Write a protein that binds this ligand. Structure first.
Ligand code: G02
Length: 268
């Protein structure tokens, strides 16, 4: 994996926490902004294996919709994982701060990009296990990049919760939840239901209702991601294909699913 010399890296601001270190925004040497995850003195053998293993898997991904690794510092302490930096930050916070500001076509385009990144990961035999809008970064072209910042009952498929079966098909369930997050501008899935109430509702057959202003085709697709039977869910190749066809014939997105009102206002 590309080894970066520490003299080329400047840590500027803390932006998060790692498993045994912090996460920073900084600059990498024509300076480019970067995000930097460190592994601090005293880390265990397993932590080092997991940290360098993470850099190793990230280094082999090369896709428009997957966060790009700039390189690693392994020859000096503290060790570092260095990625490109996305000014617009995480998708969930981004949408909540930009409520109502995008077109349907822009929102669906974000979903196609996420789906393309997930198709790539699944094809590379990588199961994400924590796909959610909080783990997707947005650049200044509105391009979404699948990432994993570490630690999600309400995003997780029933078989993964029940017996720890994490596969690309449980990632498809999570993707359906991400579709709902995007189309609602970052609403909390299942609102104030507790984790136990969410699992009970899912087991009883209930599913998230349609977002406001949501294309019928998009709601139909997210519903098929939430089939109880894992084998019936679309594969990521199916999701990408459908989203690409809807975008390329954008009148297909003008037909909206009915929104169930929770509140009735009667006026003359
Ligand atoms: C430094 C770093 C190390 C690893 C990862 C990361 O995504 N790792 C990862 C691990 C397994 C699988 C994948 C995936 F497959 F790509 F998704 C990615 C991301 C980052 N970059 C980050 N960027 C950012 C960030 C980047 N741009 C704007 C705002 N924040 N935040 C991060 C992180 C890590 N944690 N946090 C909170």
């Amino acid at each position: 994996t590309t080894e970066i010399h520490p003299s080329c890296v400047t840590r500027q601001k803390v932006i998060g926490a790692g498993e045994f270190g912090e996460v920073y925004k900084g600059m990498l040497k024509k300076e480019v902004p970067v995000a930097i995850k460190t592994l601090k003195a005293g880390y265990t053998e397993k932590q080092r294996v997991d940290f360098l293993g993470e850099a190793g898997i990230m280094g082999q991904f090369s896709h428009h919709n997957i966060i790009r690794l700039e390189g690693v510092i392994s020859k000096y302490k503290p060790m570092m994982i260095i990625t490109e930096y996305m000014e617009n930050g995480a998708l969930d916070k981004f949408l909540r701060e930009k409520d109502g500001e995008f077109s349907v076509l822009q929102l669906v385009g974000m979903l196609r990009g996420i789906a393309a990144g997930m198709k790539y990961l699944a094809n590379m035999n990588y199961v994400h296990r924590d796909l959610a809008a909080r783990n997707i970064l947005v650049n200044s072209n509105l391009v979404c990049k699948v990432s994993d910042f570490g630690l999600p009952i309400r995003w997780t498929a029933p078989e993964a919760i029940s017996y720890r079966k994490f596969t690309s098909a449980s990632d498809v369930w999570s993707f359906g939840i991400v579709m709902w997050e995007v189309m609602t501008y970052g609403e909390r899935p299942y609102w104030e239901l507790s984790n136990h109430e969410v699992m009970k509702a899912i087991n009883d057959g209930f599913r998230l209702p349609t977002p406001m202003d949501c294309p019928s085709a998009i709601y139909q697709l997210m519903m098929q991601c939430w089939q109880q039977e894992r084998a019936r869910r679309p594969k990521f190749a199916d999701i990408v294909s459908i989203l690409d066809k809807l975008i390329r014939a954008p009148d297909s997105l003008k037909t909206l699913a009915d929104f169930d009102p929770r509140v009735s206002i009667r006026l003359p």
